[PDB]
Amino acid sequence: EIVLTQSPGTLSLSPGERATLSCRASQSVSSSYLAWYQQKPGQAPRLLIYGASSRATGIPDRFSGSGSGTDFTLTISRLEPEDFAVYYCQQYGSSPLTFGQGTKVEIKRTVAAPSVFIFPPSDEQLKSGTASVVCLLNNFYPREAKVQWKVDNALQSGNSQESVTEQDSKDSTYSLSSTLTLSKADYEKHKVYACEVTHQGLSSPVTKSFNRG
Amino acid sequence: EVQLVQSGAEVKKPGESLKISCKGSGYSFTSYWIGWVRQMPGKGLEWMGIIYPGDSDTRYSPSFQGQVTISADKSISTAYLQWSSLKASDTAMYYCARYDGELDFWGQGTLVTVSSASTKGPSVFPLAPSGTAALGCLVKDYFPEPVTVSWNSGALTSGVHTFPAVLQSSGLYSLSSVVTVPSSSLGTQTYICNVNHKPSNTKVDKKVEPK
Fold first, then answer.
1. Residues A59, A104: one domain?
2. Do B125 and A125 touch (CB under 8 A)?
3. By the 8 A CB rule, do A119 and A136 touch?
């Protein structure tokens, strides 16, 4: 089969900048049989470009494609807010049909440090035998961030989960919520609960903490 | 206009059978091939196979050959994708699409969730505030997705972040919703998160204040 490799994984650019997205094939593909799709969160993929360089119906002029042999590009000449999405290339010349792994185009803005907040478990939850400790990292950029949970100075690993919001439509930042989960028994055996946050915008790690009780 | 309309979201247990559907309208259904595409959570697009509804000529992607059955009923302009015995690893969004060579029209997708977990309503715990303050709710131990969360019955929207759920080892989901507010408001303004989990008919209002 023909394997399609897209690069970069993530493209970070400001509105008005030119986006150049790459799709490399494991062997030569006729330009007639290379397509690009756009996908927004919670939406089906939409055809953008077909035959390497032709715009699909309804697609604005700022989208273009070029390439042949093993190397293809999708170009967005000047990015609009609505263009920030995931893009997939696809070949349909030789079966089986294959897709690239996708490139996310996200908004580059000025680096912004997270505001950090820690929340102890509720007394109601403790009654049930489990303790959830929550750390919020609010309104930061870029997306990459590190949460390090500490319990009486012991670095925790493997007992936490986190998720991140979609890039904010107004300020282009992200927020992150992390939950440390431990048994009520473990929670009551220890005193100091700390969330240490590392991020590009912080000169040094920020730690928020509480003492149990 | 050309439309492909897929059947609704499915929540299943491992070992159960399932046939999902894709109905075409606004064109000659028996004149075009229909493809099926898988998209696992947070992952890319995968080609599954293709069918010509006119004669049911069917080709499978090598990875899906013998794993699913693709079929069609031309009399009702419908294409199908089916599993005899679902696995948790079949959890994904499934798209049908009309084949031109490229895929020019797409269905809206059918979400298929496969888990050994059973329907369960959430517990809602406060994330209590202790000059910008943050407060919130922890919506813990529910199945399946989704939940809805509002603040003050929709009156509070500014500074709200409702996070994607995480799937715990228990097979149950956990989600947080937070809001940042003036520290000065903490003594005077009531903050209530309104949580609804339709699958279990569990609706909860949690007032959140300093402990």
1. yes
2. yes
3. yes
The last residue of one of the domains, among A45, A77, A109, is A109
Which residue from B46, B109, B180 is facing A44, i.e. has the nearest CB? B109
Which own/partner pairs from A159-168 qualify as long-range (CB within 8 Å, at least 24 positions apart)? A161/B166, A161/B168, A161/B174, A162/B166, A163/B163, A163/B164, A163/B165, A163/B166, A164/B163, A164/B164, A165/B161, A165/B162, A165/B163, A165/B164, A166/A41, A167/A84, A167/A106, A167/A107, A167/A143, A168/A139
What domains can be seen in chain B, in order of their start residue?
1-116 (2.60.40.10), 117-211 (2.60.40.10)
What is the layout of strands, in order, in the sheet containing A115-119? A115-119, A130-140, A174-183, A160-164
- CA-based radius of gyration for chain B: 22
Does residue A14 contact residue A106 with C-beta atoms inside 8 Å? no
What's at B134, amino acid-wise? A
Write down the experimental method used for this entry: X-ray
Residue A181's domain comprises: 110-212
User: Which residues make Cβ contacts (< 8 Å) with residue A164, sequence separation at least 6?
Assistant: A143, A174, A175, A176, B163, B164
Flag if B168 and A177 touch (Cβ within 8 Å).
Answer: no
Minimal Cβ distance to B44: which of A50, A102, A121: A102
Q: Do residues A82 and A119 share a domain?
A: no
Q: How many Cβ atoms are within 10 Å of A87's Cβ, its own excluded?
A: 25
Last residue of a domain, one of A109, A129, A160: A109
* Strand B148-151 with B192-197, pairing: antiparallel
Domain total for chain A?
A: 2
